[PDB]
Every structure is written in C-alpha cells, then in structure tokens.
Design a protein around this ligand. Sequence first.
Ligand SMILES: NC(=O)c1ccc(NCc2cccc(O)c2)nc1
Ligand SMILES: NC(=O)c1ccc(NCc2cccc(O)c2)nc1
Lengths: 242, 242
Amino acid sequence: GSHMWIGVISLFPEMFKAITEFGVTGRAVKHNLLKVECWNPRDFTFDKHKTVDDRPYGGGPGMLMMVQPLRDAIHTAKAAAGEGAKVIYLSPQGRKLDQGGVTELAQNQKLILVCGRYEGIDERLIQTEIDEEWSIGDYVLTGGELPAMTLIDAVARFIPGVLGDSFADGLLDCPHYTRPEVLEGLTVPPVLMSGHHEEIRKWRLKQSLQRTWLRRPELLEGLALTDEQRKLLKEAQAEHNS
Amino acid sequence: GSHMWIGVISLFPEMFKAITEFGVTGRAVKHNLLKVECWNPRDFTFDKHKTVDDRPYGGGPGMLMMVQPLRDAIHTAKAAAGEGAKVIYLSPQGRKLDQGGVTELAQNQKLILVCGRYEGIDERLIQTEIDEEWSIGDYVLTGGELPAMTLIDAVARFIPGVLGDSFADGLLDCPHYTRPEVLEGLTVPPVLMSGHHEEIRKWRLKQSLQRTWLRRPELLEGLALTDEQRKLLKEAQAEHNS
Ligand SMILES: NC(=O)c1ccc(NCc2cccc(O)c2)nc1
Ligand SMILES: NC(=O)c1ccc(NCc2cccc(O)c2)nc1
C-alpha cells in the first residue's frame, strides 16, 4: 500500500534484526509493509583485512569511517533504490527528531539511512552524498545504528496496516489503568468505571493537559488550544491551586 | 571496575542482542564491564496462552501491559539487583534525555529498565515500582526496547575501559576529514595538513562554535563561553557576515 522501503548502510547489519524480527515492526516486514535492506561497507573493501576505518587529517585520538568502502556502499544502495530516495545521515549534529519530523520523514516512500561509527564520516561525503542530517536527541552513542532503528520504528507506525496519539494533538498522554481495581491500596478513578464515554473522554483530555502543563509546560506554549482544551486546562490549574 | 549492571524487563529480550553481541557495547559485555540481564513478563504468566496484555478501564482502542506478570518480573529483577538499583521507565511522558542526563544516569552502578509495549503500563505501577521516568526524545515508538538500548549505549560510553567529546563542552562537533586529499573536487582544509597542533585545535574549536551557532543557537545561550571561545565565535560570525 503505502509500502516503505528503507536502505541501510551499516557495519553491523545484524543489529537491525531487533526491528525486522520482532514485534509490530517485525510483522510489518513479514507482511511486506516495510522493507529494510542493508549494505555493509565491509563488503566493499578490497584489502586483505577488510579495513573500514581511517585516520583523520589533522590528528586526534579518534578514527573516521574510511571513505571508499562507505561511498561505494552508499552508491550501491542508491542504485537499488532507484529514483526519489532521500539519503539521511544520523548524527548528533543533525536536525533534532520530534514527532512532527517523523511525520515529515514518513511521507517518503524510500529512505536510505547511513549509520556512522567511530567519529563519523568525512564532511565531504555529507556534502556530496547526504540529503538530510538528523539527530534522535542530544546525546552521543557508539554508532548510528540505534538512531536509524529508532527512526525506522517511529516512521513505520505511520504506514497504513502496521498498527492494529494524544501526542498527535501535541500533549503528553493521560494515565491509564487496567486490572485489578485496587493495586497496593491505589484505586482506579471512578469515572473510568462509569461507562460514561463523554465524561471519560473529557477526564482523559484534562489529565493530558494537566500532565503536559506540569511536566513539559513549553510544549503547551507551542499549541493553539481548542476552546474545550482551554477550559479543562483552566480547571486542572485551579484544582492544582486548590 | 566501574562495572555497570543493567536489568531489563522486556517482552522481547532478544532485541537486546543488538547491543550485547556487537560493536563497542558487545565488547563491554564480553569483558564484563557491562552486564545486561533480561526478564520477560511472559515467563511470569500462569494462563495457558501466556497473556501479557490487558484492557484499559474506561475503554479505548489500545491495550496495556498486564499488571501481574509485569509486576512479578520487576520484583524478580529488583531481588537480583540487591540494594541501590534505580528503576527507570522509558516513555514519551518522561524526563527528556540529553547528555547531561546520561552523565547523571551513568553514576548508577545498577539500573533496572522497564520496557513498555502497547499503550504502556498501569499508572499505579509507575507510582509503586518506578523511581524515574525518562524519554529519549519527543516521538512515539512501538515499544520501550529501543529507548532502553539507546540509554544503555549512551551510559556505557562513560564506563572506564569501554571506549578505546566536543559535546562534553556543550558544542556540536567540528567537520572531520580523512583520505583522499581531494574528493569530488573538494579539498581538505590546508590547516589540517599543516601539522600545527595549536592552529588545528583552534580551527576545530572555531568550527564547532560556528556550527553550533548556525544549527543550534539555543545550545549556545546555555553556555558560559571561555575567553578563547568568545573570541573564535566572534571571528566566525564576522567571517559569516563577510
Ligand atoms: N544523537 C544521534 O542521533 C546520534 C547519532 C549517531 C551517534 N553516533 C555515531 C556517530 C555519528 C556521527 C558522528 C559521531 O561522533 C558519532 N550517536 C548519536
Ligand atoms: N520517546 C520514548 O522514550 C519512548 C518510550 C517508549 C515508547 N513506546 C512504548 C510506550 C511506553 C509508554 C507509553 C506508550 O504510549 C508507549 N516510545 C517512545
């Protein structure tokens, strides 16, 4: 349908089994809603020791991805993708990922995700081969693989058929409760047992607004609250001030 | 040494092979710098079909983690951990992870990471079993496993012996270059070929400052720049204004 093809360039393709073999994403792959195809720069080496790293000009303690095997792997993935694939490099220097950015990236039918290791890749490859540079958050990991998997999982959720959000309207989720009715002395809010669908809807919305206000008030300033939301937030804030 | 033990509660323990079997984190596990131990709530079920999800009070289209198997798995992990383990729940409602938060979490010798699936876990379990709620970014994934792996990888980097940052001083990284000297017409900055260590250090620092200013200027307002940094940033900005 709105099938997504994702090409991955990675020195550790087997890490991606974590998303292709399990859960909701594993089902998406099995049902051909999502295709994940990996190229390993190690396969594009020609020396005896299959060297995939190289020394940075100017010195320093770190290494970089070696250009030739990585470049060749990228070119091979682009040829497989055909026309219209967006090439993305995951790094801490990239555009910060959030749900709006996920929905933007999900519009692409084809993506190629380049996973850097060591201290990343040559700046000129970013200039010549990469379309967009993205970050999954302001922290440093040992490789771009977990960020690529994170991105794949987040965009997969927008593929029709993959799933069987309060974040959609920009708020944190309300609390949820399941059995038992009492758990270490803590009871389920009676409204959720009432069967009153409208009261339940409004309770949940009010809780989301109150939680967003208390935990992440900057998220609220980015929203144009509806009439109903302005009301429930005012109520939640008044109850908080007792 | 500063060994880290991380207990994981997950319906898909095999996803964690992505960090325990490969790369720098895989080496940390093999060398006993990092221990990752998983408990699967499915193993704590008692019904024939090993049910691990349950219906939310109040209705709605989603499911929650079933309380009893998850609670029992958590209790088992806590007993294994002994004293002083911090229990962390990964969710979009949690404290946003950044490098400072990683360095804080890395101070813990023991962590227990609870991975939610479906629409997450019962709010009362958060109250009774969870010490801290963390998010790896403002986006929604199909489970807490990739966020837990992300957290594990980020904190592992602070374990002595695991690695063989410009982010440390709060800036984006400078560009890096490796062979060849010319790549699709693009040359390496001559300073990096000069062998002049101090000029190279200052170039890199100036590039980091310029890149942080252009891409993420809000990161700069959070810093108390050194004298040297104030100077190189002014220079970079003047060159940008030509
Ligand atoms: N925040 C992220 O999206 C993210 C991405 C990659 C990564 N590590 C690989 C890498 C890649 C580039 C430069 C570099 O120094 C290290 N760590 C975190
Ligand atoms: N941003 C994160 O750290 C993150 C964490 C978990 C997650 N999904 C599992 C889950 C857990 C809780 C509620 C819920 O609705 C879904 N997705 C993203």
